[PDB]
Amino acid sequence: GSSGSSGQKGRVETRRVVHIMDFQRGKNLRYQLLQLVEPFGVISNHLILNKINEAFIEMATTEDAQAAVDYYTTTPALVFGKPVRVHLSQKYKRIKSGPSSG
Numbered sequence: 001g002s003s004g005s006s007g008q009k010g011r012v013e014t015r016r017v018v019h020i021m022d023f024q025r026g027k028n029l030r031y032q033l034l035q036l037v038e039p040f041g042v043i044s045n046h047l048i049l050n051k052i053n054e055a056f057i058e059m060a061t062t063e064d065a066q067a068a069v070d071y072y073t074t075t076p077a078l079v080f081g082k083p084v085r086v087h088l089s090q091k092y093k094r095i096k097s098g099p100s101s102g
Helices: 029-034 062-074
Strands: 017-021 043-048 055-059 085-089
Touching: 017 062, 029 043, 029 055, 055 062, 062 085
Parallel strands: none
Antiparallel strands: 017 055, 017 085, 043 055
């Protein structure tokens, strides 16, 4: 579209938000995406927009999410059989909160 800038950079240990795109949906989709981090760590909170193929998964430890990414650079992440995109973003302070809030 008309939103995005180029420029590479090192690494940073801040929160955990693995962005996944180019992924399709169908039967047990939420799992197809969560399976990209599940075996990489624990699931804290995920998010799947019902508008486009944009989803974000939050891990309990940045160490996990970060790892899930190193798997996309070394190994091709084929979702549902087709290739996709995986990145290590850092948004959504708290995708979800606890019931503690009267």
